[PDB]
Amino acid sequence: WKEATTTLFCASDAKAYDTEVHNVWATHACVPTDPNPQEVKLENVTENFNMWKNNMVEQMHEDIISLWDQSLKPCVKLTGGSVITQACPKVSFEPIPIHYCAPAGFAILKCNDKKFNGTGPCTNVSTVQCTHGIRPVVSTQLLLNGSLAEEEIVIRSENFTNNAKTIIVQLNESVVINCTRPNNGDIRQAHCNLSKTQWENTLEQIAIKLKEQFGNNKTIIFNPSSGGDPEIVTHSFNCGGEFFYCNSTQLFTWNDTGRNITLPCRIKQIINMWQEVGKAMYAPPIRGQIRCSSNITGLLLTRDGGNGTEIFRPGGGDMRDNWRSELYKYKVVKIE
Ligand SMILES: *[C@@H]1O[C@H](CO)[C@@H](O)[C@H](O)[C@H]1NC(C)=O
């Protein structure tokens, strides 16, 4: 079998009666999943995997972009010199698991190694028809509603010596963060709550995996975002069709030397688009309480670099990194 680039088709459990945009897009661009997927483990076979050059990350990415271009209609969209204005009605926004599968003559390989670091060989390979349900969660600094690692915290980078490369952290235990726009004074003011002690344990367990990649003479320190667009400066995401911008300063101030962490949040109308370079405008925040509990299953940090003391700051920006943390243990091959 050889790795080829084909036209994938997505599968989903989308209800036709649900008017939530993901359920509507998936009842249009996807197919009903198979209740009994046949995963066949390959005997005595070792294959090469590369998550950093996977095509499925691309086709998924374009599908999410095409999804958003039909789902979240902005009032004003501004790209390089051109202006796009249209109706901007608020909708139901709750990401549904999207399964990706291979066409006829093709199959999907799956690495089952418990320590797989992203690139290299694999001794435990199987062949499934469709990938697992990947919730297309668009967020920064922290990954959400994703798939946890089976064993330990498997940090992954394209080049660890390269400080410009994003290290995608995959947790083995999740932390639940509850974000809330109180009903009520300020319709843009919101917040999020998570366990303070549960969070300091993650920063500690991660700082051990970081001493296994850069040396045990290193002192791991976590600092906030350096600068840039608020999308990567704060923990930006989308809860209830609203774009939250949670200041994660308290999340990224740590050293090895209350009980709840409350992140000050802000519902913003103007968004720096991730699909392409530009800006988008949406209607003012809706009425009532906007709230959704999420599971922090992964991270997106970076390294400063440039001796002894290693500083790590929250990253993000490229939503392909979001897909890779789910589409790493996979590849498309052509069966003869
Ligand atoms: C993968 O190989 C076998 C299952 O096929 C298993 O015994 C072994 O522990 C796995 N490898 C790792 C990384 O543990």
Ligand SMILES: *[C@@H]1O[C@H](CO)[C@@H](O)[C@H](O)[C@H]1NC(C)=O
């Ligand atoms: C969870 O991760 C911790 C270290 O971060 C590890 O010690 C533990 O074995 C993991 N739990 C399981 C059951 O994978």
Ligand SMILES: *[C@@H]1O[C@H](CO)[C@@H](O)[C@H](O)[C@H]1NC(C)=O
């Ligand atoms: C890894 O990153 C370093 C620093 O950017 C670079 O000099 C080196 O060429 C890279 N190594 C690889 C894998 O080519």
Ligand SMILES: *[C@@H]1O[C@H](CO)[C@@H](O)[C@H](O)[C@H]1NC(C)=O
């Ligand atoms: C988050 O809300 C969940 C229910 O969704 C609850 O179990 C938990 O106590 C809340 N956590 C925090 C830190 O508020």
Ligand SMILES: *[C@@H]1O[C@H](CO)[C@@H](O)[C@H](O)[C@H]1NC(C)=O
């Ligand atoms: C690094 O580890 C070696 C191991 O013996 C130790 O001698 C040395 O003091 C350490 N150096 C630093 C930079 O901490």
Ligand SMILES: *[C@@H]1O[C@H](CO)[C@@H](O)[C@H](O)[C@H]1NC(C)=O
């Ligand atoms: C949020 O972070 C900003 C700087 O990024 C800081 O000035 C502010 O004090 C933080 N808010 C709170 C209440 O922690």
Ligand SMILES: *[C@@H]1O[C@H](CO)[C@@H](O)[C@H](O)[C@H]1NC(C)=O
């Ligand atoms: C580092 O650790 C000390 C003691 O826990 C704490 O008071 C201080 O705020 C921390 N500051 C950093 C991140 O250097």
Ligand SMILES: *[C@@H]1O[C@H](CO)[C@@H](O)[C@H](O)[C@H]1NC(C)=O
């Ligand atoms: C995670 O999933 C839950 C349940 O669908 C949802 O309420 C929440 O908004 C999701 N989080 C994000 C940021 O997509």
Ligand SMILES: *[C@@H]1O[C@H](CO)[C@@H](O)[C@H](O)[C@H]1NC(C)=O
């Ligand atoms: C968090 O999400 C997982 C699967 O994504 C789900 O099983 C679980 O019920 C959710 N909440 C928690 C922390 O149990």
